[PDB]
Design an enzyme around this catalytic site. Structure first.
Site, PDB file in Angstrom:
ATOM      1  N   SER A  47       0.784  -1.227  -0.196  1.00 44.95           N
ATOM      2  CA  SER A  47       0.095   0.112  -0.024  1.00 44.95           C
ATOM      3  C   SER A  47       0.781   1.338   0.014  1.00 44.95           C
ATOM      4  CB  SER A  47      -0.641  -0.146   1.147  1.00 44.95           C
ATOM      5  OG  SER A  47      -0.063   0.168   2.518  1.00 44.95           O
ATOM      6  N   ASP A  48       0.297   2.187  -0.785  1.00 46.21           N
ATOM      7  CA  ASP A  48       1.036   3.531  -0.364  1.00 46.21           C
ATOM      8  C   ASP A  48       0.634   3.823   1.270  1.00 46.21           C
ATOM      9  OD1 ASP A  48       2.374   6.089  -0.629  1.00 46.21           O
ATOM     10  OD2 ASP A  48       1.293   6.439  -2.568  1.00 46.21           O
TER      11      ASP A  48
END
Ligand SMILES: *[C@@H]1O[C@H](CO)[C@@H](O[C@@H]2O[C@H](CO)[C@@H](O[C@@H]3O[C@H](CO[C@H]4O[C@H](CO[C@H]5O[C@H](CO)[C@@H](O)[C@H](O)[C@@H]5O[C@H]5O[C@H](CO)[C@@H](O)[C@H](O)[C@@H]5O)[C@@H](O)[C@H](O[C@H]5O[C@H](CO)[C@@H](O)[C@H](O)[C@@H]5O[C@H]5O[C@H](CO)[C@@H](O)[C@H](O)[C@@H]5O)[C@@H]4O)[C@@H](O)[C@H](O[C@H]4O[C@H](CO)[C@@H](O)[C@H](O)[C@@H]4O[C@H]4O[C@H](CO)[C@@H](O)[C@H](O)[C@@H]4O)[C@@H]3O)[C@H](O)[C@H]2NC(C)=O)[C@H](O)[C@H]1NC(C)=O
Ligand SMILES: *[C@@H]1O[C@H](CO)[C@@H](O[C@@H]2O[C@H](CO)[C@@H](O[C@@H]3O[C@H](CO[C@H]4O[C@H](CO[C@H]5O[C@H](CO)[C@@H](O)[C@H](O)[C@@H]5O[C@H]5O[C@H](CO)[C@@H](O)[C@H](O)[C@@H]5O)[C@@H](O)[C@H](O[C@H]5O[C@H](CO)[C@@H](O)[C@H](O)[C@@H]5O[C@H]5O[C@H](CO)[C@@H](O)[C@H](O)[C@@H]5O)[C@@H]4O)[C@@H](O)[C@H](O[C@H]4O[C@H](CO)[C@@H](O)[C@H](O)[C@@H]4O[C@H]4O[C@H](CO)[C@@H](O)[C@H](O)[C@@H]4O)[C@@H]3O)[C@H](O)[C@H]2NC(C)=O)[C@H](O)[C@H]1NC(C)=O
Ligand SMILES: *[C@@H]1O[C@H](CO)[C@@H](O[C@@H]2O[C@H](CO)[C@@H](O[C@@H]3O[C@H](CO[C@H]4O[C@H](CO)[C@@H](O)[C@H](O)[C@@H]4O)[C@@H](O)[C@H](O[C@H]4O[C@H](CO)[C@@H](O)[C@H](O)[C@@H]4O[C@H]4O[C@H](CO)[C@@H](O)[C@H](O)[C@@H]4O[C@H]4O[C@H](CO)[C@@H](O)[C@H](O)[C@@H]4O)[C@@H]3O)[C@H](O)[C@H]2NC(C)=O)[C@H](O)[C@H]1NC(C)=O
Ligand SMILES: *[C@@H]1O[C@H](CO)[C@@H](O[C@@H]2O[C@H](CO)[C@@H](O[C@@H]3O[C@H](CO[C@H]4O[C@H](CO)[C@@H](O)[C@H](O)[C@@H]4O)[C@@H](O)[C@H](O)[C@@H]3O)[C@H](O)[C@H]2NC(C)=O)[C@H](O)[C@H]1NC(C)=O
Ligand SMILES: *[C@@H]1O[C@H](CO)[C@@H](O)[C@H](O)[C@H]1NC(C)=O
Lengths: 833, 832
Positions: free
Chosen positions: A258-259
């Site tokens: 994920s960011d």
């Protein structure tokens, strides 16, 4: 509202192609692991808990140290005695495969020597939908072909140097505005979810997905999914982009992270194809996690199949083995959070043993040479009326403009480069590194003049117009410096909230060039910027005799430019985007207003494939400087175009495997002799009471309605027609046509030519020309060479939404070769293939 | 009110000493001149009428081009393609006779190649009465002996290169405040006449006059008289300073020119000793002159005798010939007033032919070498706690201070240097020169670090203390830059009206050092400044490991300093003034408020000879860094002091040279187009009164001509007079002094031995400098330094005798490394 169709199950790894061996080893190690150990591989330990911007806990029983993930795509972020390389856009401007690889290797060496296992880059998302997007510069080019090749080479340099590269941002993060809820709130906008990128299936295949296909084929180990939504499903839980496009069609074998703050659910994200949560908590230091404890529980309660988590682990360990990280491992020898030698081990709560946190290892080697060279080879000579190169016999040299001189707060004096002060060598946000130093053009150009005993001054206040006009009058040459900055959305400089507000020169740029050009008949403009700027007011001024765009050169800016100015380097760079007359000519407006009430703003890519030059060409607009334009101190001729036709896969997957065993809930409770560090994210349960130790308000609530059809299906799956290889079905890489052309240096000095090869695929809704092949060829005066390339099946195809496959349409196709997207002296019909 | 007694008649030249040849040639040519040709030599042609700052019309019929006079004491003003040398105060800080000479030469060459006949420098007035005086940096040192020697050496350098040097400002122009009526008005003060410096006869001989005696003896061709009064008589019509002190006692054979706006009368000045009016008009472009037409009339009507004007012309031609200017002559090849290639020949009215006014001649040669060297050898290491030299291996270097960085308007971005932005390499006003470029400390230091592969940054905003602290916590060395600026009266920076409002570091200097030192255990301070600043807030901070004072280095500033920090050059410079604890410790306050109504302010030099160290010592104050103090990368030893005793009364009558005719010979020639505002020697008509336009013409004339002002008969030669720089008797060598000097450290370098005497008596300074040298020694190398004391060196000025007398109080001699570090001393034997 745009809708994102489900695609399940989330495909499992299979030792595809060049992953055979890493997969075997991943499988053998994960087979030994307890479920909590597995979970540790998947979840960061909390914002600022350890050394790196991202860090997992590792598996100490098996001697696997925590994985350390560090920014950025142009050099180590938040560290010391590292290099600062030119930006990705500079790599694009070189049009040089080789330099891209050499810059990747130089970065992987530095990362590796700091004990970092994963580089948070290179970037190809954003691709560059809008010329004012805050982050285009971090990537390459709005051209998918140019971007995908340089993206791939960058990745290969990093990974051959022993570090896992992260292809980001996946996918469609084409603007900074409304990319994050809290971030928009800080700017006075109230939204419930992040901007949604709504794109048709043909456009995403032919543009935004294409560099990612290249990245996957070249062996990239990790992918970072984006903050934005795509068809109103978040980037980091969008089964269509993750399970279908990336993992089933592209056949991606590595892991998805994920960011930081892009993880929005435990169960949904795990089933929609995510593999790793960063920084590991729900919000920065929440002491809570969608994964960690919650993922352990989600497997114990039967909601997430063991085979998903085992697959998460397998993909993470396979990426780690594939680059041989294990052979180089060492704990991170610096801290991202302090420069002190000594500090508490766990920075954020200030806990753990008090010890050495920084070792000040100098990782730079002689990488300044590659940075210097790359900066010179990325300087685009846009205009030259026999003004350049300089000889050094210039009697009096005026260096004009703030962009020539020093940041008065010191090269690193703005946090994450959040200002545009002094020369612009690096744009802002997390795609940054600390300079070891910064050579300014003022410094390099004055040193050169003094070497020849000339006279020289720098005026660096752009409203000191009175002094500018007076000196320009007395000058043999006026070198004027101007810039336009941008960056990540969490920083605003002068009300530019990541995205640029306009494409006009900053700090009185246009007025400065005019004040000079009114007074020197030999006024030479140098532009440092994240992307194109509006040059219409002054480019065709009779007195502006040359214009250069040098991008973001990194630490050797001043020397790179002098090498070009004074002819040590013949410029061979070519513009990797379009210079248009107006902002309007580019189209592709940013969404800068709430357009769906207090919901997620909607960003419809209604131009389809028609971005940058494709768009200009569709509208019959004349760029000032077209995509692919660059001058040289020599001339080249292209002749003898010739075309030659050439002679040129599982249908189902295995069932989902499991590795190792899952035991009782009591197996996974907090071990007894273990001090739990504040804010630290662990994989363990407080008790065997599942519901209570998850602490999730929605625990067990309508569970089956929230697990999508297909999401738990471990049985053999069909292989997509477009899939079953790496970066697509391998037939897409069959070479169908060989193209050759003779390239000659017709001038007086050695130089690099950049042959460019375009095709027209034909059809009522296709761009006139699209780039397919290029190279950069060094040639002595009068020297001739035969440039040979090949077109693949993918190169000649279009995405057919009904077939779900690339198809060579029956429209007739042509090849064009020449020196820019508008300077194409050679054409040939292609035979049916 | 102080009063300035008359001395008349104005002494005429006599081919004295080294002037005999030049005088003969001057007499030969002046003898062929008409009155109007003579007057042309004495008067500028008007402000901005020609090319140079000051310019005469010459004598075309006799092939003598107009004389071009140009600033500055440290390089050509208002020109192009010239060099920018370090200031006088740096020359002083070097204590190096040879370097002063080489700098003079290098400048002379440049001026010569521009077609400049007369350089407006060097300066030894201001001497330096007050540490906050605005032009002290222009001169040398507040010590007369140091200043006199280096002033003379500069003069010799300029003049051996074939340009006339102008010793200025004569005399007592010790502060900028109130130096001019019009300037004082623009600053809000109403005064009828300029500031009057009031000094007793002893003090002027032992302090302020002494370097002018050295200048005269060294052969200076010109003296520029000053804007101030001395005892309420203007410096350019002071019969006492000009006729008695300069011409009768010191035997000056050259010519005296007015400062610009300092000429205040026609007849009175001529008779009081003035020889040249600059810029030629009464006020800038007034189209009137106190001389020109007026001086022709004054001769024709019998008020100024022919012998006086003849004498002006002889003094002027003789100076021109003594330096060999005739052999090197060319019209000025640049314009002070525009950088354009073409322009009207007569700039101010924009009249005359439209032709080439700049030729862009690059006179720089290789002068950047002398400059870079002078800059290194003028960098005083005040403190070194084993911090320097740097090795190049420092891992991370922090360059801190606006004073390290670029002037954001361009090195020349502030007119006449009238600002303090970026590195301070030149103070302000007319004592300036356009940089051909400026090498900043930022540029030289970073280039150095990059050469060794280190990390380095420069922070140049003195209120970015947050960035400063963060970076200092990370650096192996912090190099912190601070400055304090001043300049000529007509410019005001930050309300500093030429003079400094204080001795404190500009641009947050103290807070910057403190902010660094609170964070790097290795903070090294570099000061660029026009004179002392206060250091007591931080000099002894435990993290302040070194302090250097680099003065106003000129164009190579950064390379000069790098050379010192990195050990290519071992610093040998010495402080040429005192570094006190407080502004109070210097005494000698400026006169900053009217103290005489709306008449001229009165500036009583009531301290006498007790300026700088002389005063610190008299009050038993301890300076932080004493006059003569400077450290080295090596150490020296002084020992073995040995002392050994060694073994015209009337003038001619005043001459006249050539003939004076009827008025009608001097009317404007008929073919001639009179340029507007241009000053000519001619008359409108044979009507003298009407041609003069003076409201006072012919009214009470004899009562306004002091007794003896027209006396052409043989005059008594004064007892202290008769030679060049005073009676030759006073240059007899009476005592020889010797010592052994050894380099006892591990680095080649220069020692500056200093010899002080104590003349004895209740009113004498405890110690006064008399001799020095700069001796180069390798590690372990020894040398004998031998020097002599003249009769002058042992004397005090006796007011009753009007002579130098060796008084009967017993005298001592001291030799050492500074005015406070004097391990060698002995009683001197009685000599007479
Ligand atoms: C074993 O242990 C496990 C670990 O402890 C336990 O796991 C927990 O399980 C719970 C279920 O029991 C989970 O709670 C439910 O979560 C869902 C999913 O929320 C996420 O996804 C939303 C979009 O999801 C779609 O797509 C995803 C994949 O991306 C799918 O997985 C989903 O199925 C769904 O798929 C459809 O849509 C896609 C297209 O997008 C298609 O392709 C598919 O075909 C399907 O059609 C997403 O929107 C959610 O985002 C919200 O949450 C974010 C914070 O997490 C926030 O950032 C967002 O802004 C947004 O906030 C808003 O909503 C939340 C609650 O969700 C509020 O708190 C918040 O304040 C805002 O209002 C999220 O990312 C979620 O939909 C469920 O909630 C819905 O249903 C409940 C009632 O059941 C309602 O109360 C809610 O209002 C909400 O209802 C909306 O949708 C309804 C349709 O179902 C509709 O009827 C309503 O009108 C309404 O609008 C639950 O929250 C929990 O997440 C999970 N915990 C962990 C740690 O994993 C497990 O229970 C346990 N097992 C056992 C047996 O005990
Ligand atoms: C042949 O042709 C020639 C060329 O064309 C003709 O030349 C002209 O001759 C005229 C005489 O006929 C001259 O006019 C008179 O000039 C004098 C001198 O003025 C200047 O000097 C003042 C100081 O003088 C002393 O020092 C000088 C040497 O430096 C000596 O030369 C003097 O003799 C005098 O010496 C004494 O003092 C010193 C000590 O200081 C001693 O050492 C000596 O022993 C003596 O004791 C100086 O102060 C004057 O300054 C003024 O002018 C400046 C502008 O130029 C200005 O910047 C100053 O601020 C100051 O301004 C004030 O004064 C003037 C008037 O002069 C006003 O305009 C102004 O508004 C201010 O108020 C200057 O530098 C001058 O003193 C005479 O003026 C006095 O006398 C008349 C009466 O005769 C009065 O009307 C005046 O008010 C004035 O009065 C003062 O003095 C009186 C006593 O002396 C006193 O009684 C008063 O109470 C009062 O305070 C005349 O102006 C003319 O200069 C000259 N022209 C040129 C171009 O050279 C020549 O005539 C012709 N020959 C023949 C035969 O035809
Ligand atoms: C004190 O100092 C000042 C400052 O230096 C001195 O003032 C200067 O003195 C110069 C004289 O020495 C005087 O020079 C004159 O310059 C004039 C302008 O020159 C320029 O323009 C022309 C024309 O387009 C160009 O040729 C030239 O190169 C310049 O650019 C010239 O015009 C003058 O030329 C005349 O005299 C010289 C000799 O001096 C002759 O060689 C020349 O041919 C000219 O002679 C004519 O005029 C004279 C009388 O004026 C006649 O006698 C002669 O027969 C010629 O006559 C014919 O032509 C005229 C008009 O052209 C016509 O009316 C007549 O009928 C005939 O046909 C000369 O070169 C400077 O201008 C002057 N400077 C200033 C600012 O005023 C001053 O002398 C010094 N005082 C003392 C006592 O030394
Ligand atoms: C998931 O990842 C987590 C983070 O990487 C893992 O947590 C870590 O596990 C280790 C080893 O199992 C624990 O170490 C114990 O730590 C102390 C060390 O403390 C120190 O202090 C003393 C002070 O005098 C010093 O003597 C030591 O050298 C240490 O510097 C030891 O006493 C024990 O023998 C043992 O090593 C970590 O503390 C723990 N980290 C945190 C932050 O809690 C966790 O194991 C992972 N989970 C799985 C299932 O693999
Ligand atoms: C688990 O227990 C810890 C330790 O007491 C407590 O602080 C935390 O809030 C609990 N977590 C949950 C979900 O209850």
């Amino acid at each position: 509202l745009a809708f994102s169709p489900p695609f399940y199950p989330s495909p499992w790894a299979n030792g595809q192609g060049e992953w055979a061996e890493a997969y075997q080893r991943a499988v053998a190690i994960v087979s030994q692991m307890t479920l909590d150990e597995k979970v540790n591989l998947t979840t960061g330990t909390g914002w600022e808990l350890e050394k790196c911007v991202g860090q997992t806990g590792g598996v100490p029983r098996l001697n696997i140290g925590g994985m350390c993930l560090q920014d950025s795509p142009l050099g180590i972020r938040d560290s010391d005695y590292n290099s600062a390389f030119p930006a990705g856009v500079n790599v694009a401007a070189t049009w040089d495969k080789n330099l891209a690889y050499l810059r990747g290797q130089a970065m992987g060496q530095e990362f590796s020597d700091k004990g970092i296992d994963v580089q948070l880059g290179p970037a190809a998302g954003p691709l560059g939908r809008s010329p004012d997007g805050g982050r285009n510069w971090e990537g390459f080019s709005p051209d998918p072909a140019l971007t995908g090749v340089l993206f791939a080479e960058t990745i290969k340099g990093i990974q051959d140097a022993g570090v896992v590269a992260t292809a980001k941002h996946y996918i469609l993060n084409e603007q900074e505005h409304f990319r994050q809820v809290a971030e928009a709130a800080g700017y006075g906008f109230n939204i419930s979810d992040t901007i949604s990128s709504n794109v048709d299936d043909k456009t995403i295949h032919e543009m935004y997905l294409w560099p990612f296909a290249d990245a996957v084929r070249a062996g990239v180990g990790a992918i970072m999914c984006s903050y934005n939504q795509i068809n109103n499903s978040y980037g980091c839980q969008n089964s269509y982009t993750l399970n279908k496009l990336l993992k089933a069609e592209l056949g991606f074998q590595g892991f998805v992270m994920s960011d930081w703050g892009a993880h929005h659910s435990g169960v949904g994200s795990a089933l929609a194809g995510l593999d790793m949560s960063m920084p590991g908590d729900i919000t920065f230091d929440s002491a809570t996690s969608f994964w960690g404890t919650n993922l352990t529980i989600a497997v114990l309660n039967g909601t997430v199949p063991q085979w998903r988590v085992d697959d998460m682990a397998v993909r993470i360990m396979a990426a780690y083995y594939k680059v041989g990280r294990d052979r180089l491992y060492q704990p991170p020898n610096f801290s991202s959070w302090t420069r002190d030698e000594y500090g508490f081990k766990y920075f954020y709560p200030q806990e753990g043993p008090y010890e050495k946190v920084n070792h000040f290892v100098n990782v730079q080697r002689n990488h300044s040479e590659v940075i210097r060279k790359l900066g010179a080879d990325s300087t685009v000579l846009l205009k030259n009326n026999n003004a350049l190169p300089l000889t050094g016999k210039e009697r009096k040299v005026a260096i004009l403009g703030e962009d020539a001189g020093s940041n008065s707060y010191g090269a690193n004096g703005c946090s994450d480069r959040g200002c545009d002060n002094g020369t612009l060598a690096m744009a802002w946000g997390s795609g940054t590194a600390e300079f070891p130093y910064l050579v300014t053009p003022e410094q390099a150009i004055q040193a050169e003049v003094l070497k020849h005993k000339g006279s020289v001054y720098a005026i660096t206040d752009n409203w000191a117009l009175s002094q500018v006009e007076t000196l320009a009058k007395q000058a043999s040459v006026s070198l004027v410096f101007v810039n336009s900055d941008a960056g990540e959305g969490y920083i605003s400089v002068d009300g530019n909230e990541g995205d640029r507000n306009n494409l006009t020169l900053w700090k009185n740029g246009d007025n400065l060039i005019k004040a000079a050009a009114n007074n020197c008949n030999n006024t030479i403009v140098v532009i440092h910027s994240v992307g194109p700027v509006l040059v219409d007011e002054w480019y065709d001024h009779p007195n502006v005799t040359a214009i250069l765009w040098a991008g973001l050169p990194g630490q050797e800016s001043g020397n790179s430019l002098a090498d070009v100015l004074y002819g040590r380097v013949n410029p061979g760079a070519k513009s990797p985007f379009t210079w248009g007359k107006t902002r309007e000519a580019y189209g592709d407006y940013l969404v800068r207003e709430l357009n769906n009430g207090n919901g997620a703003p909607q960003d419809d890519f209604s131009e389809g494939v028609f971005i940058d030059y494709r768009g200009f060409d569709k509208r019959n607009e004349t760029p000032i400087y077209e995509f692919g334009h660059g001058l040289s101190y020599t001339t080249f001729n292209y002749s003898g175009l010739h075309i030659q036709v050439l002679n040129a896969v599982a249908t189902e997957t295995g069932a989902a495997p499991t590795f190792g065993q899952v035991g009782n809930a009591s197996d996974y409770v907090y071990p007894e002799g273990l001090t739990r560090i504040s804010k630290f994210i662990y994989p363990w349960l407080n008790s065997t009471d599942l519901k209570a130790s998850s602490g999730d308000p929605y625990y067990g609530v309508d569970t089956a309605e929230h697990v999508p059809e297909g999401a738990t299906d471990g049985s053999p799956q069909p292989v997509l027609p477009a899939g079953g290889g790496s970066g697509g079905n391998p037939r897409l890489y069959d070479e169908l046509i060989r193209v050759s052309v003779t390239v000659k240096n017709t001038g007086r000095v050695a130089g690099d030519a950049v042959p460019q090869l375009y095709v027209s695929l034909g059809g009522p809704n296709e761009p006139k020309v699209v780039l397919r092949k290029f190279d950069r060829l060094t040639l002595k005066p009068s020297e001739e060479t035969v440039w040979t390339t090949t077109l693949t099946r993918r190169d000649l195809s279009n995405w057919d939404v009904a077939a779900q496959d690339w198809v060579i349409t029956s429209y007739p196709k042509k090849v064009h070769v020449g020196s820019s997207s508008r300077q194409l002296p050679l054409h040939a019909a292609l035979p049916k293939v």
